[PDB]
Amino acid sequence: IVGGQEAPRSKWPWQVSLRVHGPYWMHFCGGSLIHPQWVLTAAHCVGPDVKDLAALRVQLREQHLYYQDQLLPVSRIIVHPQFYTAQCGADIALLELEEPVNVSSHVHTVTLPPASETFPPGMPCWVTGWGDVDNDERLPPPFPLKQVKVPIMENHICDAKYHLGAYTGDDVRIVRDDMLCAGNTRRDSCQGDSGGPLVCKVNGTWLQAGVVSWGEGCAQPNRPGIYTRVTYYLDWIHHYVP
Amino acid sequence: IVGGQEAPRSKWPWQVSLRVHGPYWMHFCGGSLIHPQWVLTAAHCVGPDVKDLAALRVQLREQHLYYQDQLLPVSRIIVHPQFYTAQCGADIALLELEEPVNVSSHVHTVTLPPASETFPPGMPCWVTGWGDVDNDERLPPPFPLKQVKVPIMENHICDAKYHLGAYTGDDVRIVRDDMLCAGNTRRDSCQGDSGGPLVCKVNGTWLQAGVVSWGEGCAQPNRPGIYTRVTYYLDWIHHYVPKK
Amino acid sequence: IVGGQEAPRSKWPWQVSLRVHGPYWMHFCGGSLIHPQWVLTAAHCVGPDVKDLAALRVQLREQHLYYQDQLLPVSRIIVHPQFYTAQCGADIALLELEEPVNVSSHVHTVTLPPASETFPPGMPCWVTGWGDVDNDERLPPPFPLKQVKVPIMENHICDAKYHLGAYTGDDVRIVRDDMLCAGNTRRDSCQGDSGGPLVCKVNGTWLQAGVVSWGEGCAQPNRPGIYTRVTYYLDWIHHYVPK
Amino acid sequence: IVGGQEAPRSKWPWQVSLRVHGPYWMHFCGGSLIHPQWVLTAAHCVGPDVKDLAALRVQLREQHLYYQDQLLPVSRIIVHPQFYTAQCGADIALLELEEPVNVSSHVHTVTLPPASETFPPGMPCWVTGWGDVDNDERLPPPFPLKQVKVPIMENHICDAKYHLGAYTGDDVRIVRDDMLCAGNTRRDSCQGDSGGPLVCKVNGTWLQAGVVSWGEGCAQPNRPGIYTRVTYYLDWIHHYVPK
Ligand SMILES: *C[C@@](*)(O)[C@H](CCCNC(N)=[NH2+])NC(=O)CNC(=O)[C@@H](N)CCC(=O)O
Numbered sequence: 001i002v003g004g005q006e007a008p009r010s011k012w013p014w015q016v017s018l019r020v021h022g023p024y025w026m027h028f029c030g031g032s033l034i035h036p037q038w039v040l041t042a043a044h045c046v047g048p049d050v051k052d053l054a055a056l057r058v059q060l061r062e063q064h065l066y067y068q069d070q071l072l073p074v075s076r077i078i079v080h081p082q083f084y085t086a087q088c089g090a091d092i093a094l095l096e097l098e099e100p101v102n103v104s105s106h107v108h109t110v111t112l113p114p115a116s117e118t119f120p121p122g123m124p125c126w127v128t129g130w131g132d133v134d135n136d137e138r139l140p141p142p143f144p145l146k147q148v149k150v151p152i153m154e155n156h157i158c159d160a161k162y163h164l165g166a167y168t169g170d171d172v173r174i175v176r177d178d179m180l181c182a183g184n185t186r187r188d189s190c191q192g193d194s195g196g197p198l199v200c201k202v203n204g205t206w207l208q209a210g211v212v213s214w215g216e217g218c219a220q221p222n223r224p225g226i227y228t229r230v231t232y233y234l235d236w237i238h239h240y241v242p
Numbered sequence: 243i244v245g246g247q248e249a250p251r252s253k254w255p256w257q258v259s260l261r262v263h264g265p266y267w268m269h270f271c272g273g274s275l276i277h278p279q280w281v282l283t284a285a286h287c288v289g290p291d292v293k294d295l296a297a298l299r300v301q302l303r304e305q306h307l308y309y310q311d312q313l314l315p316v317s318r319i320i321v322h323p324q325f326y327t328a329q330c331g332a333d334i335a336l337l338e339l340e341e342p343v344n345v346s347s348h349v350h351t352v353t354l355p356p357a358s359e360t361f362p363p364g365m366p367c368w369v370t371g372w373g374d375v376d377n378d379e380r381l382p383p384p385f386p387l388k389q390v391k392v393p394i395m396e397n398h399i400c401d402a403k404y405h406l407g408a409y410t411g412d413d414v415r416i417v418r419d420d421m422l423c424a425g426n427t428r429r430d431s432c433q434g435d436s437g438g439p440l441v442c443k444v445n446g447t448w449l450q451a452g453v454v455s456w457g458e459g460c461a462q463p464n465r466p467g468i469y470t471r472v473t474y475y476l477d478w479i480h481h482y483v484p485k486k
Numbered sequence: 487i488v489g490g491q492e493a494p495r496s497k498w499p500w501q502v503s504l505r506v507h508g509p510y511w512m513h514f515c516g517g518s519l520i521h522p523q524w525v526l527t528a529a530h531c532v533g534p535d536v537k538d539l540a541a542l543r544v545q546l547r548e549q550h551l552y553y554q555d556q557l558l559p560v561s562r563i564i565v566h567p568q569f570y571t572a573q574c575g576a577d578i579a580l581l582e583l584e585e586p587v588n589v590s591s592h593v594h595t596v597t598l599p600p601a602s603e604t605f606p607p608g609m610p611c612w613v614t615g616w617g618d619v620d621n622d623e624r625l626p627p628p629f630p631l632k633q634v635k636v637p638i639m640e641n642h643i644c645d646a647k648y649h650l651g652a653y654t655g656d657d658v659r660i661v662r663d664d665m666l667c668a669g670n671t672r673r674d675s676c677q678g679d680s681g682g683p684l685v686c687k688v689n690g691t692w693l694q695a696g697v698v699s700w701g702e703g704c705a706q707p708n709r710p711g712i713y714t715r716v717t718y719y720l721d722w723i724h725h726y727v728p729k
Numbered sequence: 730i731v732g733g734q735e736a737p738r739s740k741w742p743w744q745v746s747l748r749v750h751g752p753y754w755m756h757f758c759g760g761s762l763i764h765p766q767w768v769l770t771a772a773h774c775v776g777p778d779v780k781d782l783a784a785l786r787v788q789l790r791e792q793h794l795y796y797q798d799q800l801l802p803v804s805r806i807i808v809h810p811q812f813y814t815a816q817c818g819a820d821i822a823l824l825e826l827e828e829p830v831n832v833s834s835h836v837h838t839v840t841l842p843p844a845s846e847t848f849p850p851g852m853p854c855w856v857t858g859w860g861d862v863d864n865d866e867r868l869p870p871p872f873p874l875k876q877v878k879v880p881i882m883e884n885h886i887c888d889a890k891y892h893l894g895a896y897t898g899d900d901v902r903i904v905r906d907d908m909l910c911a912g913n914t915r916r917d918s919c920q921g922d923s924g925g926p927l928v929c930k931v932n933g934t935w936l937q938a939g940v941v942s943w944g945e946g947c948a949q950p951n952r953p954g955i956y957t958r959v960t961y962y963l964d965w966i967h968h969y970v971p972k
């Protein structure tokens with residue numbers, strides 16, 4: 001998370017950390033608890049190539065990474081069939097836990113938006129995670145969960161910005177319909193924030209608008225962060241998630 | 243280059259090294275001399291974002307990198323308009339040299355294939371370059387130009403191989419029509435070989451079949467190297483480069 | 487630490503962590519609280535060249551590095567005047583804290599040994615710290631304080647071991663009288679463990695025998711860890727630190 | 730080499746490169762050909778611990794590293810018996826080539842100084858090598874041999890400079906009689922230049938004054954480069970190398 005501040009213990013109960021086995025259970029991606037047995041993340045975290053489920057654990061909401069680890073095994077990874085690279089869409093994945101979680105007030109699920117919600121610019125949105133604090137700068141110990149308010153951008157404005165200082169034809173779409181844009185040069189998500197949720201408060205409810213997907217660097221000029229648009233994939237999500 | 247051997251001084255006169263300015267004029271990509279003023283390379287080398295032409299030089303065929311440098315400036319970089327990421331196609335770009343080259347027997351152009359040439363499996367093809375010798379293993383000094391004979395694979399076989407041990411739906415194409423497949427677990431191109439030519443001897447002539455583009459690792463099982471299919475982009479190439 | 491295990495919360499109350507300012511207050515050395523306003527460390531941590539006292543803080547006994555930081559400023563660094571390189575001796579330093587600490591049961595001082603204590607082989611000794619877990623392998627998060635029981639070796643035996651597979655003349659001392667040897671191929675201290683205490687239980691008391699100083703690699707054959715012998719420097723220590 | 734320029738093909742015929750086996754025969758140290766079968770280098774290159782002679786080769790004077798390699802095996806490594814660390818003296822070693830070299834005009838030996846030569850300040854001295862071009866900055870391809878003219882400094886001036894911004898007692902000798910000082914903030918030797926010769930033109934002859942040994946960083950203020958004084962070790966050299 002580029003910009004923002006440390007998140008209070010009360011906020012973001014649906015935030016999850018994905019761990020990979022090595023010299024320790026290392027954080028590599030974020031995710032959101034969308035159902036007591038289902039985690040929504042980004043496909044580029046776990047795909048396109050198949051990984052060993054044994055080398056993967058899930059950690060639910062914790063203020064400081066690695067301090068009070070209670071790691072949960074995963075029974076299934078479901079990656080969108082249309083996925084190969086993050087920039088070309090379908091950057092969405094589901095992880096099914098071995099067992100469902102006993103949801104408390106400190107740890108509970110996020111609401112997915114209704115199919116009609118567009119999330120227009122000027123929407124109050126937050127992105128949370130334990131990713132890089134800047135370009136090639138890791139989040140320093142004790143690894144607090146960070147939060148940043150990000151400005152939503154109209155897809156066509158963002159697509160135009162991505163064409164500035166690029167050789168790509170103006171008629172060729174860089175930012176697509178299954179994507180969402182947010183952030184500026186002070187506020188953005190970074191590496192290790194992928195899969196993490198972009199949440200907006202709509203009608204007094206916290207809905208998950210997007211999943212951290214990609215961008216050209218972190219908080220670079222004319223390169224806002226691109227998120228997978230959750231509304232676009234609700235049918236696919238609901239084919240597995242109740 | 244994974245596998246193969248050091249190339250003799252006589253072979254591959256069209257091979258070029260692209261250099262980027264830093265503490266030295268560092269090799270980052272390969273390319274091929276297709277016309278005395280034009281270099282054919284991969285778009286992911288120079289794009290999608292526009293770079294300063296001043297920080298880019300071209301080095302023609304040399305046996306050992308950096309030892310006898312005669313660096314040439316570039317007046318134009320033309321990246322295919324449909325390009326953004328290597329895996330999603332249009333990974334092709336042209337570089338116009340500020341001055342034409344005096345083509346000798348040791349340094350001369352490669353012939354582009356006729357639009358109809360398909361390059362079927364069992365074709366004798368070579369890939370050349372100064373890229374990594376293995377995964378995360380740089381080519382050691384004195385940096386000799388390497389060559390490897392690579393087996394051509396049918397696109398459908400190759401698209402099927404890329405689906406093995408992948409979550410991508412079988413009905414979703416990974417290897418597109420503007421792409422070509424070559425190599426195995428012993429023979430492949432690697433990082434720093436991009437833009438480099440895949441040449442095949444057809445009817446006693448050396449034709450450039452492809453441009454080193456992408457792959458999952460280097461010489462990994464069921465992951466052959468993916469090249470940009472030159473035939474697919476001839477019309478775009480010939481919009482800038484003279485036919486004759 | 488190479489070998490051993492995570493230390494229980496009750497053990498080693500005198501263990502300290504030295505912090506250097508950067509993107510965060512990073513651990514670079516250990517030390518021991520020998521008096522409520524004095525920390526005993528290794529000179530190679532802070533010298534031979536003078537550093538800014540402002541970029542240095544001290545953290546007292548904590549189970550996991552960085553999680554519950556209460557960083558203390560330092561008013562003075564006193565490096566032994568003979569010191570230049572770790573291998574050539576005098577690898578000892580004192581840090582004076584701006585204010586003394588309120589010593590609890592969880593955080594209190596270590597006893598320095600009497601001048602006569604030799605620490606013979608077969609002594610039960612421990613080395614503690616947050617250093618590397620192996621050669622070029624950092625201690626992984628949540629950075630627990632590690633402990634290892636190390637076998638003491640006689641100086642003449644150890645100097646002989648250091649001459650095996652070395653060009654140095656047999657008559658030339660590598661392991662000097664101001665040094666102590668401990669550890670094997672399974673048990674040793676490593677990089678980031680320097681300054682850290684080597685403690686032995688003698689007559690029901692915990693005495694600091696040494697300070698982590700140097701060695702050839704971590705847990706290598708015929709290369710035990712070399713510690714600064716605290717008894718050798720008691721007069722210098724007591725010139726600044728109250729007994 | 731920090732500062733200076735690429736050396737012409739005619740200059741420094743005695744310069745050698747020491748190679749270690751790995752993914753390629755990599756340059757790690759410099760040296761000088763003092764006799765057709767003998768290379769003079771620094772002991773910290775090859776010691777204090779004994780290495781496998783099989784994994785070590787010698788390359789004679791070449792303009793660009795790795796281009797036209799003609800690697801020579803080594804039969805014997807003789808490290809000064811008093812050596813353990815570079816800063817504490819005796820940083821000198823000899824390599825005996827498996828067979829003597831056919832000395833040409835482009836590749837020949839350097840003249841060792843007479844025992845009486847002191848090399849006073851204001852002497853025109855050069856240091857050559859393929860070491861780092863700055864702190865943590867490797868020499869870029871095609872790896873040309875570099876050369877830099879370095880100002881000689883009196884040992885007492887040097888020792889005093891090494892005490893500025895250091896905790897070491899003023900009466901504690903850091904720079905000793907078996908050492909020589911040269912260089913400033915623009916001109917110095919660096920990592921990978923060790924073993925490399927410091928040559929001075931005296932009475933129309935090129936004499937090897939020193940061997941690149943140590944320093945605090947490269948071209949840092951009040952930290953000139955320390956070289957092993959060849960005159961100090963002539964008796965030891967001549968015990969193995971013919972006059
Ligand atoms: C997988 C995940 O950790 C990252 C982070 C998303 C980046 N977000 C913003 N706002 N920049 N996603 C990726 O790594 C996907 N690929 C890319 O973002 C690349 N186009 C840039 C790679 C780079 O600069 O490191």
Ligand SMILES: *C[C@@](*)(O)[C@H](CCCNC(N)=[NH2+])NC(=O)CNC(=O)[C@@H](N)CCC(=O)O
Pocket residue numbers: 270271284286287328430431432433434435436437454455456457458459460461466467468
């Ligand atoms: C840009 C160029 O040097 C490389 C060479 C392709 C590797 N060749 C074969 N045969 N596998 N092109 C790329 O690296 C394009 N991106 C990818 O290949 C990615 N799938 C992996 C990128 C990476 O290694 O980080």
Ligand SMILES: *C[C@@](*)(O)[C@H](CCCNC(N)=[NH2+])NC(=O)CNC(=O)[C@@H](N)CCC(=O)O
Pocket residue numbers: 515528530531572674675676677678679680681698699700701702703704705710711712
């Ligand atoms: C300064 C302190 O953290 C280290 C650790 C002592 C190592 N303990 C054992 N048993 N090996 N002390 C030093 O780094 C002093 N210099 C050396 O130990 C060198 N001889 C080796 C350097 C290295 O391995 O990196």
Ligand SMILES: *C[C@@](*)(O)[C@H](CCCNC(N)=[NH2+])NC(=O)CNC(=O)[C@@H](N)CCC(=O)O
Pocket residue numbers: 758771773774815816917918919920921922923924941942943944945946947948953954955
């Ligand atoms: C072994 C050899 O390549 C170097 C060269 C000495 C640096 N020369 C000048 N003129 N500054 N010798 C060493 O690395 C020996 N140890 C040291 O120099 C240490 N005092 C500093 C630690 C380090 O930078 O390695």
